[PDB]
GROMACS .gro file of C-alpha atoms in nm:
model
  310
    1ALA     CA    1  -0.538   3.309  -0.846
    2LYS     CA    2  -0.427   3.145  -1.171
    3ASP     CA    3  -0.517   2.782  -1.243
    4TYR     CA    4  -0.242   2.592  -1.426
    5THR     CA    5  -0.427   2.261  -1.460
    6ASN     CA    6  -0.458   2.278  -1.838
    7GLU     CA    7  -0.152   2.498  -1.900
    8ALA     CA    8   0.156   2.353  -2.072
    9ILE     CA    9   0.387   2.365  -1.768
   10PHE     CA   10   0.417   1.989  -1.721
   11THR     CA   11   0.749   1.853  -1.845
   12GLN     CA   12   0.717   1.490  -1.736
   13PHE     CA   13   0.445   1.233  -1.672
   14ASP     CA   14   0.458   0.860  -1.604
   15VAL     CA   15   0.250   0.584  -1.443
   16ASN     CA   16   0.380   0.278  -1.258
   17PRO     CA   17   0.350  -0.009  -1.250
   18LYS     CA   18   0.285  -0.054  -1.621
   19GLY     CA   19   0.096  -0.344  -1.774
   20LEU     CA   20  -0.206  -0.527  -1.634
   21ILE     CA   21  -0.240  -0.443  -1.265
   22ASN     CA   22  -0.335  -0.761  -1.078
   23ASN     CA   23  -0.453  -0.647  -0.733
   24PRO     CA   24  -0.491  -0.334  -0.513
   25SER     CA   25  -0.224  -0.448  -0.264
   26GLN     CA   26   0.046  -0.221  -0.407
   27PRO     CA   27   0.005   0.149  -0.491
   28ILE     CA   28  -0.041   0.277  -0.846
   29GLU     CA   29   0.225   0.548  -0.881
   30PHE     CA   30   0.205   0.872  -1.073
   31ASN     CA   31   0.514   1.081  -1.142
   32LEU     CA   32   0.477   1.442  -1.253
   33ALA     CA   33   0.724   1.721  -1.322
   34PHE     CA   34   0.659   2.088  -1.390
   35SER     CA   35   0.835   2.421  -1.428
   36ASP     CA   36   0.777   2.790  -1.493
   37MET     CA   37   0.802   2.743  -1.870
   38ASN     CA   38   0.457   2.753  -2.028
   39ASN     CA   39   0.454   2.687  -2.403
   40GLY     CA   40   0.805   2.827  -2.426
   41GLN     CA   41   0.707   3.134  -2.227
   42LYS     CA   42   0.831   3.223  -1.882
   43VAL     CA   43   0.564   3.254  -1.612
   44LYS     CA   44   0.593   3.380  -1.254
   45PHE     CA   45   0.414   3.158  -1.001
   46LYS     CA   46   0.234   3.361  -0.735
   47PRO     CA   47   0.112   3.255  -0.389
   48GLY     CA   48  -0.230   3.102  -0.444
   49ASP     CA   49  -0.175   2.986  -0.802
   50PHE     CA   50  -0.258   2.616  -0.834
   51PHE     CA   51  -0.330   2.310  -1.045
   52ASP     CA   52  -0.547   2.007  -0.991
   53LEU     CA   53  -0.486   1.639  -1.049
   54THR     CA   54  -0.775   1.400  -1.111
   55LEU     CA   55  -0.722   1.027  -1.067
   56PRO     CA   56  -0.919   0.817  -1.321
   57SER     CA   57  -1.227   0.607  -1.253
   58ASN     CA   58  -1.528   0.444  -1.414
   59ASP     CA   59  -1.846   0.297  -1.267
   60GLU     CA   60  -1.671   0.006  -1.094
   61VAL     CA   61  -1.308   0.112  -1.046
   62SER     CA   62  -1.189   0.438  -0.889
   63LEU     CA   63  -0.836   0.546  -0.802
   64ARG     CA   64  -0.791   0.764  -0.496
   65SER     CA   65  -0.527   0.899  -0.259
   66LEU     CA   66  -0.437   0.680   0.040
   67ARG     CA   67  -0.491   0.983   0.262
   68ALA     CA   68  -0.811   1.096   0.436
   69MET     CA   69  -1.007   1.367   0.251
   70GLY     CA   70  -0.864   1.709   0.333
   71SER     CA   71  -0.517   1.582   0.428
   72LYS     CA   72  -0.233   1.829   0.372
   73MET     CA   73   0.137   1.787   0.294
   74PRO     CA   74   0.393   2.067   0.260
   75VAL     CA   75   0.611   2.089  -0.050
   76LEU     CA   76   0.955   2.218   0.043
   77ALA     CA   77   1.241   2.384  -0.144
   78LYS     CA   78   1.610   2.407  -0.047
   79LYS     CA   79   1.782   2.554   0.435
   80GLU     CA   80   1.419   2.453   0.387
   81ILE     CA   81   1.142   2.677   0.265
   82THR     CA   82   0.775   2.591   0.212
   83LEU     CA   83   0.690   2.671  -0.149
   84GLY     CA   84   0.377   2.465  -0.195
   85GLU     CA   85   0.104   2.265  -0.032
   86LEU     CA   86  -0.065   1.946  -0.148
   87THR     CA   87  -0.420   1.869  -0.042
   88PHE     CA   88  -0.544   1.513  -0.091
   89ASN     CA   89  -0.918   1.498  -0.161
   90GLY     CA   90  -0.997   1.140  -0.264
   91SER     CA   91  -0.957   1.114  -0.641
   92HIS     CA   92  -0.877   1.487  -0.647
   93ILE     CA   93  -0.534   1.624  -0.553
   94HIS     CA   94  -0.483   2.000  -0.516
   95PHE     CA   95  -0.150   2.178  -0.540
   96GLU     CA   96  -0.115   2.540  -0.428
   97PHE     CA   97   0.189   2.769  -0.429
   98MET     CA   98   0.269   2.927  -0.092
   99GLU     CA   99   0.397   3.276  -0.002
  100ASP     CA  100   0.768   3.201  -0.041
  101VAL     CA  101   0.736   3.111  -0.407
  102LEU     CA  102   0.803   3.483  -0.451
  103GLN     CA  103   1.166   3.415  -0.353
  104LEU     CA  104   1.287   3.214  -0.650
  105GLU     CA  105   1.366   3.315  -1.007
  106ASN     CA  106   1.329   2.980  -1.183
  107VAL     CA  107   1.079   2.733  -1.041
  108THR     CA  108   1.073   2.359  -1.111
  109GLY     CA  109   0.925   2.069  -0.919
  110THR     CA  110   0.827   1.705  -0.906
  111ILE     CA  111   0.533   1.518  -0.755
  112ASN     CA  112   0.528   1.146  -0.687
  113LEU     CA  113   0.166   1.060  -0.613
  114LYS     CA  114   0.058   0.728  -0.465
  115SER     CA  115  -0.290   0.591  -0.526
  116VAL     CA  116  -0.508   0.295  -0.434
  117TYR     CA  117  -0.803   0.154  -0.627
  118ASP     CA  118  -1.138   0.011  -0.526
  119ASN     CA  119  -1.317  -0.239  -0.750
  120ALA     CA  120  -1.690  -0.303  -0.707
  121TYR     CA  121  -1.714  -0.578  -0.970
  122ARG     CA  122  -1.837  -0.912  -0.835
  123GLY     CA  123  -1.930  -1.089  -1.157
  124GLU     CA  124  -1.836  -1.448  -1.244
  125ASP     CA  125  -1.625  -1.374  -1.553
  126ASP     CA  126  -1.281  -1.215  -1.523
  127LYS     CA  127  -1.290  -0.852  -1.636
  128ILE     CA  128  -1.047  -0.579  -1.742
  129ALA     CA  129  -1.088  -0.211  -1.659
  130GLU     CA  130  -0.924   0.040  -1.891
  131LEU     CA  131  -0.856   0.373  -1.721
  132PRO     CA  132  -0.639   0.579  -1.959
  133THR     CA  133  -0.546   0.910  -1.800
  134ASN     CA  134  -0.346   1.233  -1.809
  135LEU     CA  135  -0.460   1.314  -1.454
  136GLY     CA  136  -0.685   1.579  -1.605
  137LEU     CA  137  -0.389   1.783  -1.729
  138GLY     CA  138  -0.506   1.869  -2.081
  139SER     CA  139  -0.159   1.945  -2.218
  140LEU     CA  140  -0.047   1.587  -2.162
  141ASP     CA  141  -0.112   1.278  -2.370
  142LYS     CA  142  -0.305   1.011  -2.181
  143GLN     CA  143  -0.128   0.694  -2.070
  144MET     CA  144  -0.315   0.364  -2.042
  145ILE     CA  145  -0.384   0.194  -1.712
  146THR     CA  146  -0.521  -0.159  -1.721
  147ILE     CA  147  -0.670  -0.304  -1.403
  148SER     CA  148  -0.772  -0.665  -1.357
  149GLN     CA  149  -1.119  -0.724  -1.217
  150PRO     CA  150  -1.109  -1.091  -1.113
  151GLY     CA  151  -1.426  -1.293  -1.147
  152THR     CA  152  -1.584  -1.471  -0.851
  153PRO     CA  153  -1.616  -1.851  -0.893
  154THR     CA  154  -1.947  -2.028  -0.831
  155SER     CA  155  -0.784  -2.264  -0.012
  156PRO     CA  156  -0.566  -2.580  -0.013
  157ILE     CA  157  -0.247  -2.385   0.067
  158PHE     CA  158  -0.145  -2.462   0.424
  159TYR     CA  159   0.039  -2.136   0.488
  160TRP     CA  160   0.090  -1.800   0.322
  161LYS     CA  161   0.138  -1.441   0.431
  162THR     CA  162   0.013  -1.117   0.279
  163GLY     CA  163   0.043  -0.747   0.347
  164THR     CA  164  -0.059  -0.404   0.228
  165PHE     CA  165  -0.061  -0.038   0.322
  166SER     CA  166  -0.314   0.096   0.570
  167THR     CA  167  -0.572   0.350   0.457
  168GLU     CA  168  -0.672   0.415   0.819
  169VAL     CA  169  -0.331   0.505   0.964
  170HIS     CA  170  -0.091   0.689   0.733
  171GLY     CA  171   0.249   0.522   0.730
  172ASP     CA  172   0.122   0.193   0.871
  173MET     CA  173   0.086  -0.145   0.699
  174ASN     CA  174  -0.144  -0.440   0.774
  175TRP     CA  175  -0.032  -0.802   0.765
  176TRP     CA  176  -0.188  -1.149   0.761
  177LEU     CA  177  -0.039  -1.487   0.853
  178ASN     CA  178  -0.280  -1.752   0.721
  179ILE     CA  179  -0.213  -2.076   0.909
  180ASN     CA  180  -0.379  -2.403   0.816
  181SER     CA  181  -0.644  -2.280   0.573
  182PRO     CA  182  -0.705  -2.643   0.462
  183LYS     CA  183  -0.791  -2.731   0.823
  184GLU     CA  184  -0.543  -3.019   0.823
  185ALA     CA  185  -0.496  -3.273   1.101
  186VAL     CA  186  -0.126  -3.187   1.135
  187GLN     CA  187   0.094  -3.452   1.292
  188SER     CA  188   0.310  -3.219   1.505
  189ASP     CA  189   0.315  -2.872   1.657
  190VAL     CA  190   0.323  -2.583   1.409
  191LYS     CA  191   0.584  -2.308   1.431
  192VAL     CA  192   0.618  -1.988   1.231
  193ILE     CA  193   0.910  -1.749   1.270
  194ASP     CA  194   0.831  -1.414   1.112
  195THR     CA  195   1.106  -1.158   1.062
  196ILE     CA  196   0.986  -0.806   0.987
  197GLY     CA  197   1.221  -0.638   0.742
  198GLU     CA  198   1.421  -0.318   0.770
  199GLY     CA  199   1.245   0.019   0.762
  200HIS     CA  200   0.939  -0.071   0.967
  201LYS     CA  201   0.851  -0.212   1.309
  202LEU     CA  202   0.559  -0.394   1.467
  203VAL     CA  203   0.297  -0.168   1.624
  204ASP     CA  204   0.269  -0.249   1.995
  205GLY     CA  205  -0.055  -0.427   2.085
  206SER     CA  206  -0.182  -0.470   1.728
  207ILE     CA  207  -0.175  -0.851   1.716
  208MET     CA  208  -0.510  -1.027   1.690
  209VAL     CA  209  -0.606  -1.378   1.579
  210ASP     CA  210  -0.901  -1.524   1.390
  211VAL     CA  211  -0.971  -1.883   1.493
  212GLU     CA  212  -1.199  -2.089   1.270
  213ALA     CA  213  -1.296  -2.452   1.327
  214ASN     CA  214  -1.603  -2.672   1.284
  215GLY     CA  215  -1.820  -2.401   1.127
  216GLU     CA  216  -1.750  -2.104   1.354
  217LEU     CA  217  -1.513  -1.810   1.362
  218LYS     CA  218  -1.394  -1.614   1.663
  219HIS     CA  219  -1.187  -1.298   1.637
  220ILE     CA  220  -0.968  -1.293   1.949
  221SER     CA  221  -0.664  -1.112   2.088
  222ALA     CA  222  -0.302  -1.225   2.112
  223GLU     CA  223  -0.346  -1.243   2.489
  224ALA     CA  224  -0.643  -1.479   2.462
  225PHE     CA  225  -0.457  -1.684   2.202
  226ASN     CA  226  -0.168  -1.724   2.446
  227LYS     CA  227  -0.407  -1.862   2.707
  228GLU     CA  228  -0.600  -2.109   2.492
  229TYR     CA  229  -0.439  -2.204   2.160
  230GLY     CA  230  -0.066  -2.148   2.169
  231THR     CA  231   0.210  -1.894   2.212
  232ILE     CA  232   0.291  -1.576   2.023
  233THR     CA  233   0.613  -1.397   2.113
  234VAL     CA  234   0.764  -1.073   1.988
  235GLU     CA  235   1.131  -0.986   2.021
  236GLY     CA  236   1.247  -0.690   1.817
  237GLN     CA  237   1.166  -0.764   1.453
  238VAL     CA  238   1.087  -1.129   1.522
  239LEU     CA  239   0.728  -1.247   1.576
  240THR     CA  240   0.695  -1.617   1.651
  241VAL     CA  241   0.375  -1.820   1.648
  242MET     CA  242   0.372  -2.165   1.805
  243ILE     CA  243   0.066  -2.391   1.794
  244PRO     CA  244   0.054  -2.732   1.967
  245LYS     CA  245  -0.056  -3.027   1.752
  246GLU     CA  246  -0.400  -3.071   1.925
  247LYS     CA  247  -0.481  -2.700   1.894
  248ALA     CA  248  -0.374  -2.671   1.530
  249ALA     CA  249  -0.578  -2.975   1.427
  250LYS     CA  250  -0.850  -2.892   1.174
  251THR     CA  251  -0.833  -2.525   1.270
  252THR     CA  252  -0.743  -2.218   1.065
  253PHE     CA  253  -0.553  -1.943   1.245
  254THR     CA  254  -0.530  -1.600   1.087
  255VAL     CA  255  -0.276  -1.392   1.277
  256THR     CA  256  -0.300  -1.022   1.194
  257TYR     CA  257  -0.082  -0.730   1.299
  258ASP     CA  258   0.040  -0.388   1.190
  259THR     CA  259   0.382  -0.242   1.128
  260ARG     CA  260   0.484   0.123   1.109
  261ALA     CA  261   0.734   0.267   0.864
  262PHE     CA  262   1.017   0.471   1.014
  263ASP     CA  263   1.241   0.489   0.706
  264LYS     CA  264   1.031   0.708   0.474
  265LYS     CA  265   1.252   0.649   0.172
  266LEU     CA  266   1.289   0.270   0.159
  267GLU     CA  267   1.162   0.142  -0.176
  268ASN     CA  268   0.991  -0.167  -0.027
  269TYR     CA  269   0.887  -0.277   0.324
  270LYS     CA  270   0.953  -0.650   0.346
  271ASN     CA  271   0.854  -0.935   0.573
  272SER     CA  272   0.986  -1.290   0.555
  273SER     CA  273   0.878  -1.597   0.749
  274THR     CA  274   0.958  -1.966   0.787
  275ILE     CA  275   0.728  -2.246   0.897
  276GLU     CA  276   0.779  -2.603   1.011
  277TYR     CA  277   0.533  -2.880   1.090
  278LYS     CA  278   0.446  -3.238   0.995
  279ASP     CA  279   0.154  -3.250   0.751
  280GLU     CA  280  -0.149  -3.477   0.791
  281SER     CA  281   0.049  -3.757   0.625
  282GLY     CA  282   0.316  -3.727   0.893
  283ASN     CA  283   0.580  -3.577   0.667
  284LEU     CA  284   0.798  -3.287   0.777
  285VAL     CA  285   0.736  -2.973   0.573
  286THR     CA  286   1.053  -2.763   0.549
  287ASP     CA  287   1.034  -2.647   0.187
  288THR     CA  288   0.741  -2.405   0.175
  289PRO     CA  289   0.803  -2.169  -0.121
  290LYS     CA  290   0.918  -1.818  -0.031
  291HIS     CA  291   0.654  -1.668  -0.260
  292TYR     CA  292   0.406  -1.790   0.002
  293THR     CA  293   0.605  -1.715   0.320
  294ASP     CA  294   0.759  -1.380   0.221
  295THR     CA  295   0.606  -1.060   0.089
  296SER     CA  296   0.640  -0.683   0.081
  297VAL     CA  297   0.461  -0.354   0.037
  298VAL     CA  298   0.589  -0.099  -0.213
  299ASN     CA  299   0.657   0.242  -0.056
  300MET     CA  300   0.320   0.411  -0.017
  301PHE     CA  301   0.434   0.765   0.073
  302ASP     CA  302   0.359   1.068  -0.143
  303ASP     CA  303   0.650   1.303  -0.199
  304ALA     CA  304   0.718   1.631  -0.376
  305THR     CA  305   0.995   1.886  -0.414
  306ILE     CA  306   1.050   2.226  -0.573
  307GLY     CA  307   1.365   2.398  -0.694
  308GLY     CA  308   1.481   2.739  -0.801
  309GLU     CA  309   1.711   3.030  -0.727
  310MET     CA  310   1.640   3.361  -0.555
   0.00000   0.00000   0.00000
């Protein structure tokens, strides 16, 4: 079989987001286009021909697929016909042409690869990792990727929510509702109304709660939470957390749960929430910034397509 990795068949290449990447919460996207024109010369792709993509890395930062090693994804052409197959192997992505590539006259295609990065740096000073790359495709000019490696110092925010894609269940996302990190002596019950956005839904039975107070943490279930600390309800896209004043006092509650994407093409999977309570000073808090209460996960699905005529 012929290896096209370093051949000049790649017509497009781009990396997103651009600029200094702040955290691994969102995917680092790679867009690639190719065709049967190699250095101005027509080639005929045969079943088995392939090319390999290699995500960049250094000694502390490595980019890899979100999929488990050995995961496969078909690459279809249009009725549908399987023309290729993508195999995700960590930082290595393999593309192979399938039998039916012998159907088409002119072959073109696009690959939108999603990646996640790990960062082993734990130093005090803030650091920057430079991972310029052409995904190993020698015919392409490298594009710079800058990743921030935050230093570790030698939270006062009462409430904020976060979320990211799961690397354990493809298509799922993990979320965190951080309630009373400061461990305030709130002067009223605490209520959070979380509305999961369009395109994804809560995964049944995935709600758990971390309860930390007076030097000890306990990781419990939603059911246990409902019997000892408060009430968590779920109705459609709405997840509500209610914590009585005496139970919320000087205690941090970390409510976690998962959602599952059902709309594969939505650009972002959002989640918004509102909170109300009286702070330790007895003042009603109704103005918590949305940057703290709302968040989203950029589409983390890989996709690819091929085109041509018989």
